[PDB]
Amino acid sequence: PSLLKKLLLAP
Amino acid sequence: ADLRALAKHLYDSYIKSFPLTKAKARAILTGKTTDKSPFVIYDINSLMMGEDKIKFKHITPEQSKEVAIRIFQGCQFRSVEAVQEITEYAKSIPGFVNLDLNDQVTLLKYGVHEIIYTMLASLMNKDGVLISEGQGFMTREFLKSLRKPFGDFMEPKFEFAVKFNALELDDSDLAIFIAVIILSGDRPGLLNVKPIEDIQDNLLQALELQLKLNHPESSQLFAKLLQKMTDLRQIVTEHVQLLQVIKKTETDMSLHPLLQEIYKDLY
Ligand SMILES: CN(CCOc1ccc(C[C@H](Nc2ccccc2C(=O)c2ccccc2)C(=O)O)cc1)c1ccccn1
Ligand SMILES: [Cl-]
Ligand SMILES: [Cl-]
Ligand SMILES: [Cl-]
Protein backbone atom coordinates (compact mmCIF):
# COMPACT_ATOMS: atom_id res chain seq x y z
CA PRO A 1 0.00 0.00 0.00
CA SER A 2 1.39 3.37 -1.09
CA LEU A 3 1.06 6.09 1.55
CA LEU A 4 1.57 8.85 -1.03
CA LYS A 5 -1.45 7.50 -2.90
CA LYS A 6 -3.46 7.53 0.34
CA LEU A 7 -2.61 11.20 0.92
CA LEU A 8 -3.32 11.96 -2.76
CA LEU A 9 -6.72 10.26 -2.85
CA ALA A 10 -7.86 11.59 0.54
CA PRO A 11 -10.86 13.98 0.49
CA ALA B 1 -4.15 31.82 -19.95
CA ASP B 2 -5.19 34.06 -17.06
CA LEU B 3 -1.81 34.26 -15.36
CA ARG B 4 -2.90 36.76 -12.70
CA ALA B 5 -5.87 34.57 -11.72
CA LEU B 6 -3.62 31.49 -11.57
CA ALA B 7 -1.18 33.39 -9.35
CA LYS B 8 -4.01 34.44 -7.03
CA HIS B 9 -5.53 30.96 -6.82
CA LEU B 10 -2.14 29.45 -5.92
CA TYR B 11 -1.63 32.08 -3.17
CA ASP B 12 -5.06 31.44 -1.63
CA SER B 13 -4.28 27.70 -1.64
CA TYR B 14 -0.87 28.33 -0.06
CA ILE B 15 -2.48 30.35 2.77
CA LYS B 16 -4.84 27.43 3.43
CA SER B 17 -2.17 24.70 3.21
CA PHE B 18 0.76 26.12 5.22
CA PRO B 19 0.07 27.39 8.77
CA LEU B 20 3.36 29.33 9.20
CA THR B 21 3.85 31.59 6.15
CA LYS B 22 6.92 33.66 5.40
CA ALA B 23 5.01 36.83 6.32
CA LYS B 24 4.24 35.43 9.77
CA ALA B 25 7.74 33.97 10.22
CA ARG B 26 9.32 37.35 9.42
CA ALA B 27 6.96 39.11 11.84
CA ILE B 28 8.10 36.74 14.59
CA LEU B 29 11.79 36.97 13.66
CA THR B 30 11.75 40.80 13.66
CA GLY B 31 9.65 41.21 16.83
CA LYS B 32 6.81 42.90 14.90
CA THR B 33 4.16 40.61 16.42
CA THR B 34 1.91 40.80 19.48
CA ASP B 35 2.28 37.13 20.39
CA LYS B 36 5.01 36.17 22.83
CA SER B 37 8.38 35.29 21.34
CA PRO B 38 9.48 31.71 20.54
CA PHE B 39 11.10 29.54 23.17
CA VAL B 40 14.81 29.50 22.27
CA ILE B 41 16.49 26.08 22.21
CA TYR B 42 20.29 26.48 22.30
CA ASP B 43 21.41 23.38 24.30
CA ILE B 44 20.19 20.09 25.76
CA ASN B 45 18.90 21.82 28.92
CA SER B 46 16.82 24.35 27.01
CA LEU B 47 15.65 21.50 24.74
CA MET B 48 14.34 19.43 27.66
CA MET B 49 12.58 22.46 29.13
CA GLY B 50 11.02 23.48 25.82
CA GLU B 51 10.10 20.21 24.13
CA ASP B 52 6.87 19.84 26.16
CA LYS B 53 5.56 22.97 24.40
CA ILE B 54 6.64 22.00 20.90
CA LYS B 55 4.26 20.11 18.47
CA PHE B 56 6.61 17.12 18.14
CA LYS B 57 5.68 16.33 21.75
CA HIS B 58 2.77 14.36 20.23
CA ILE B 59 5.16 11.50 19.33
CA THR B 60 7.34 11.48 22.48
CA PRO B 61 6.44 8.61 24.92
CA GLU B 62 10.53 5.55 27.76
CA GLN B 63 14.10 6.13 28.88
CA SER B 64 15.77 9.44 28.06
CA LYS B 65 17.51 9.66 24.69
CA GLU B 66 20.65 11.62 23.92
CA VAL B 67 20.14 15.09 22.45
CA ALA B 68 21.14 14.24 18.86
CA ILE B 69 18.49 11.47 18.70
CA ARG B 70 15.78 13.72 20.19
CA ILE B 71 16.49 16.34 17.51
CA PHE B 72 16.45 13.63 14.83
CA GLN B 73 13.05 12.30 15.98
CA GLY B 74 11.50 15.75 16.30
CA CYS B 75 12.70 16.81 12.86
CA GLN B 76 11.26 13.58 11.43
CA PHE B 77 7.92 14.46 13.03
CA ARG B 78 7.97 17.86 11.30
CA SER B 79 9.06 16.44 7.93
CA VAL B 80 6.08 14.04 7.83
CA GLU B 81 3.65 16.90 8.54
CA ALA B 82 5.35 19.13 5.96
CA VAL B 83 4.94 16.39 3.33
CA GLN B 84 1.22 16.17 4.17
CA GLU B 85 0.83 19.97 3.84
CA ILE B 86 2.67 20.07 0.49
CA THR B 87 0.52 17.22 -0.82
CA GLU B 88 -2.62 19.16 0.12
CA TYR B 89 -1.17 22.20 -1.67
CA ALA B 90 -0.28 20.13 -4.75
CA LYS B 91 -3.87 18.91 -5.12
CA SER B 92 -4.93 22.54 -5.63
CA ILE B 93 -2.56 23.17 -8.59
CA PRO B 94 -4.96 23.17 -11.57
CA GLY B 95 -4.57 20.06 -13.68
CA PHE B 96 -2.48 18.18 -11.11
CA VAL B 97 -5.21 15.79 -9.96
CA ASN B 98 -6.07 14.96 -13.58
CA LEU B 99 -2.59 13.51 -14.20
CA ASP B 100 -2.03 9.78 -14.02
CA LEU B 101 -2.10 8.90 -10.33
CA ASN B 102 1.32 7.23 -10.68
CA ASP B 103 2.87 10.44 -12.08
CA GLN B 104 1.26 12.45 -9.27
CA VAL B 105 3.10 10.12 -6.87
CA THR B 106 6.36 10.54 -8.77
CA LEU B 107 6.08 14.32 -8.84
CA LEU B 108 5.54 14.35 -5.08
CA LYS B 109 8.23 11.74 -4.39
CA TYR B 110 10.95 13.84 -6.09
CA GLY B 111 9.52 17.29 -5.32
CA VAL B 112 8.59 17.41 -1.61
CA HIS B 113 12.08 17.74 -0.16
CA GLU B 114 13.06 20.44 -2.64
CA ILE B 115 9.93 22.24 -1.47
CA ILE B 116 10.68 21.57 2.20
CA TYR B 117 14.11 23.17 1.87
CA THR B 118 12.69 26.12 -0.07
CA MET B 119 10.14 26.95 2.61
CA LEU B 120 12.57 26.10 5.40
CA ALA B 121 14.40 29.25 4.28
CA SER B 122 11.28 31.30 5.13
CA LEU B 123 11.73 30.22 8.77
CA MET B 124 15.49 30.89 9.06
CA ASN B 125 17.86 33.70 9.68
CA LYS B 126 21.62 33.32 9.70
CA ASP B 127 21.50 32.24 13.37
CA GLY B 128 18.60 29.82 13.73
CA VAL B 129 15.33 28.31 12.59
CA LEU B 130 11.75 28.66 13.79
CA ILE B 131 10.08 25.42 14.84
CA SER B 132 6.61 24.26 15.86
CA GLU B 133 4.75 27.02 13.97
CA GLY B 134 6.86 29.76 15.53
CA GLN B 135 6.49 28.65 19.17
CA GLY B 136 10.17 27.69 19.27
CA PHE B 137 13.46 28.86 17.76
CA MET B 138 16.44 26.50 17.50
CA THR B 139 19.85 28.10 17.11
CA ARG B 140 22.18 27.29 14.22
CA GLU B 141 25.13 26.96 16.61
CA PHE B 142 23.26 24.35 18.65
CA LEU B 143 22.34 22.29 15.57
CA LYS B 144 25.98 22.50 14.44
CA SER B 145 27.30 21.28 17.81
CA LEU B 146 25.61 17.87 17.41
CA ARG B 147 27.88 14.83 17.03
CA LYS B 148 28.58 13.60 13.50
CA PRO B 149 26.74 13.08 11.32
CA PHE B 150 23.88 14.86 13.12
CA GLY B 151 25.72 18.18 13.33
CA ASP B 152 26.13 18.15 9.52
CA PHE B 153 22.48 18.04 8.44
CA MET B 154 21.35 21.63 8.93
CA GLU B 155 24.43 23.70 7.94
CA PRO B 156 23.91 23.26 4.15
CA LYS B 157 20.30 24.39 4.60
CA PHE B 158 21.29 27.51 6.52
CA GLU B 159 23.87 28.21 3.79
CA PHE B 160 21.23 27.82 1.09
CA ALA B 161 18.72 29.94 3.06
CA VAL B 162 21.05 32.93 3.44
CA LYS B 163 21.58 33.15 -0.34
CA PHE B 164 17.93 32.42 -1.09
CA ASN B 165 16.51 34.86 1.45
CA ALA B 166 18.58 37.56 -0.27
CA LEU B 167 16.18 37.37 -3.23
CA GLU B 168 13.50 38.70 -0.81
CA LEU B 169 10.67 36.63 -2.24
CA ASP B 170 7.31 36.82 -0.52
CA ASP B 171 4.53 34.27 -0.11
CA SER B 172 2.81 35.19 -3.39
CA ASP B 173 6.12 34.65 -5.22
CA LEU B 174 6.76 31.39 -3.33
CA ALA B 175 3.31 29.95 -3.99
CA ILE B 176 4.00 29.92 -7.73
CA PHE B 177 7.66 28.86 -7.43
CA ILE B 178 6.84 25.75 -5.37
CA ALA B 179 4.14 24.77 -7.89
CA VAL B 180 6.77 25.07 -10.62
CA ILE B 181 9.06 22.71 -8.67
CA ILE B 182 6.30 20.08 -8.27
CA LEU B 183 5.43 20.14 -11.99
CA SER B 184 8.96 19.16 -13.14
CA GLY B 185 8.75 17.12 -16.32
CA ASP B 186 12.22 15.56 -15.91
CA ARG B 187 11.68 13.43 -12.79
CA PRO B 188 12.88 9.82 -13.21
CA GLY B 189 10.17 7.36 -14.22
CA LEU B 190 7.41 9.75 -15.30
CA LEU B 191 4.95 7.94 -17.60
CA ASN B 192 3.61 10.94 -19.57
CA VAL B 193 5.70 14.13 -19.53
CA LYS B 194 3.75 16.27 -22.03
CA PRO B 195 0.75 17.18 -19.79
CA ILE B 196 3.14 17.90 -16.90
CA GLU B 197 5.25 20.25 -19.05
CA ASP B 198 2.10 21.99 -20.32
CA ILE B 199 1.11 22.79 -16.74
CA GLN B 200 4.63 23.94 -15.84
CA ASP B 201 4.74 26.19 -18.92
CA ASN B 202 1.67 28.06 -17.62
CA LEU B 203 3.12 28.13 -14.11
CA LEU B 204 6.47 29.46 -15.33
CA GLN B 205 4.68 32.16 -17.31
CA ALA B 206 2.66 33.05 -14.21
CA LEU B 207 5.84 33.18 -12.13
CA GLU B 208 7.76 35.36 -14.58
CA LEU B 209 4.84 37.82 -14.64
CA GLN B 210 4.50 37.79 -10.83
CA LEU B 211 8.20 38.53 -10.39
CA LYS B 212 8.22 41.36 -12.93
CA LEU B 213 5.23 42.99 -11.20
CA ASN B 214 6.17 42.35 -7.56
CA HIS B 215 9.90 43.17 -7.90
CA PRO B 216 10.25 45.77 -10.70
CA GLU B 217 13.75 46.79 -9.58
CA SER B 218 15.12 43.19 -9.74
CA SER B 219 15.80 42.54 -13.24
CA GLN B 220 16.44 38.86 -14.02
CA LEU B 221 14.90 37.89 -10.63
CA PHE B 222 13.22 35.11 -12.63
CA ALA B 223 16.53 33.94 -14.14
CA LYS B 224 18.13 34.02 -10.66
CA LEU B 225 15.34 31.97 -9.10
CA LEU B 226 15.42 29.28 -11.81
CA GLN B 227 19.12 28.74 -11.08
CA LYS B 228 18.21 28.04 -7.42
CA MET B 229 15.93 25.19 -8.46
CA THR B 230 18.88 23.21 -9.53
CA ASP B 231 20.81 23.99 -6.33
CA LEU B 232 17.92 22.45 -4.39
CA ARG B 233 18.63 19.09 -6.06
CA GLN B 234 22.20 19.09 -4.77
CA ILE B 235 20.86 19.74 -1.25
CA VAL B 236 18.68 16.62 -1.49
CA THR B 237 21.58 14.52 -2.82
CA GLU B 238 23.81 15.53 0.09
CA HIS B 239 20.95 15.04 2.59
CA VAL B 240 20.33 11.51 1.29
CA GLN B 241 24.02 10.67 1.75
CA LEU B 242 23.86 11.90 5.35
CA LEU B 243 20.74 9.82 6.06
CA GLN B 244 22.57 6.82 4.59
CA VAL B 245 25.37 7.29 7.15
CA ILE B 246 22.74 7.25 9.90
CA LYS B 247 21.14 4.14 8.43
CA LYS B 248 24.42 2.24 8.41
CA THR B 249 25.88 3.41 11.73
CA GLU B 250 23.19 4.20 14.31
CA THR B 251 21.02 1.62 16.07
CA ASP B 252 17.29 1.73 16.21
CA MET B 253 17.03 4.71 13.85
CA SER B 254 14.51 3.60 11.24
CA LEU B 255 12.58 6.27 9.37
CA HIS B 256 8.86 7.01 9.39
CA PRO B 257 7.15 4.74 6.81
CA LEU B 258 6.20 7.80 4.71
CA LEU B 259 9.81 8.98 4.55
CA GLN B 260 10.94 5.43 3.71
CA GLU B 261 8.53 5.34 0.77
CA ILE B 262 9.78 8.66 -0.62
CA TYR B 263 13.44 7.74 -0.20
CA LYS B 264 13.10 4.21 -1.58
CA ASP B 265 14.53 4.06 -5.12
CA LEU B 266 14.85 7.86 -5.17
CA TYR B 267 17.20 8.38 -8.15
C1 LIG C 1 15.46 21.66 12.19
N1 LIG C 1 14.04 21.85 12.47
C2 LIG C 1 13.13 22.44 11.42
C3 LIG C 1 12.72 21.41 10.38
O1 LIG C 1 13.90 21.07 9.64
C4 LIG C 1 13.80 20.13 8.65
C5 LIG C 1 14.97 19.71 8.03
C6 LIG C 1 14.93 18.66 7.13
C7 LIG C 1 13.73 18.02 6.84
C8 LIG C 1 13.69 16.85 5.89
C9 LIG C 1 13.79 15.49 6.59
N2 LIG C 1 14.90 15.45 7.53
C10 LIG C 1 15.04 14.43 8.48
C11 LIG C 1 14.21 13.31 8.48
C12 LIG C 1 14.25 12.42 9.54
C13 LIG C 1 15.09 12.65 10.61
C14 LIG C 1 15.93 13.75 10.62
C15 LIG C 1 15.92 14.66 9.55
C16 LIG C 1 16.85 15.84 9.59
O2 LIG C 1 16.80 16.68 8.70
C17 LIG C 1 17.82 16.02 10.70
C18 LIG C 1 18.77 15.04 11.01
C19 LIG C 1 19.75 15.29 11.96
C20 LIG C 1 19.79 16.51 12.61
C21 LIG C 1 18.85 17.48 12.32
C22 LIG C 1 17.87 17.23 11.38
C23 LIG C 1 13.85 14.39 5.54
O3 LIG C 1 14.89 13.98 5.07
O4 LIG C 1 12.65 13.97 5.20
C24 LIG C 1 12.57 18.47 7.46
C25 LIG C 1 12.60 19.52 8.35
C26 LIG C 1 13.52 21.04 13.58
C27 LIG C 1 14.43 20.41 14.43
C28 LIG C 1 13.93 19.73 15.53
C29 LIG C 1 12.56 19.70 15.75
C30 LIG C 1 11.74 20.34 14.84
N3 LIG C 1 12.19 20.99 13.76
CL1 LIG D 1 18.78 35.08 6.13
CL1 LIG E 1 11.60 45.72 -6.55
CL1 LIG F 1 14.40 7.23 15.76
Numbering used by the authors:
A (entry chain C): 141 to 151
B (entry chain A): 237 to 297, 300 to 505
Task: Provide the authors' own sentences about this structure as they appear in the paper.
PPARγ (peroxisome proliferator-activated receptor gamma) is a transcription factor of the nuclear receptor family that functions predominantly as a heterodimer with RXRα. PPARγ is a key regulator of glucose homeostasis and adipogenesis. The recruitment of coactivators by PPARγ is primarily determined by the interaction of coactivator LXXLL motifs with the receptor LBD. Helix 12 is key regulatory structural element in the activation function 2 interacting with coregulators.
The two other mutants of interest here are localized in the Ω loop of the PPARγ LBD; M280I is in the helix 2′ of the Ω loop and I290M is in the loop between helix 2′ and helix 3. The PPARγ M280I LBD crystallized in complex with GW1929 and PGC1α peptide as a homodimer and PPARγ I290M in complex with GW1929 as a monomer. The conformation and interactions of GW1929 in the PPARγ LBPs is similar in all complexes. The M280I mutant stabilizes helix 3, notably through specific interactions with V305, that, in turn stabilizes PPARγ in the agonist conformation. Recall that the coactivator interaction is via the activation function 2 coregulator surface composed of helix 3, 4, 5, and helix 1220. In the case of M280I mutant, I280 formed a stable interaction with V305 of H3, the N-terminal end of H3. This interaction was also seen in the crystal structure of the M280I mutant described above. Decreased deuterium uptake was observed around the mutation site (from the C-terminal H1 towards the mutation site and until H3, including the Ω loop). Our HDX–MS data for the PPARγ M280I are consistent with MD simulations highlighting a stabilization of the Ω loop, H3 and H12 helices in the M280I mutant protein, compared to WT. Mammalian two-hybrid assay in HEK293FT cells using VP16-fused PPARγ (WT, M280I, I290M, and T475M), GAL4-DNA-binding domain-fused coactivator MED1 and pG5-LUC reporter confirmed that in the context of full protein, the three mutations enhanced interaction with MED1 coactivator domain compared to PPARγ WT. Together, these data suggest that the three mutations considered, M280I, I290M and T475M, promote the adoption of an agonist conformation by PPARγ in the absence of ligand, thereby enhancing coactivator interaction.
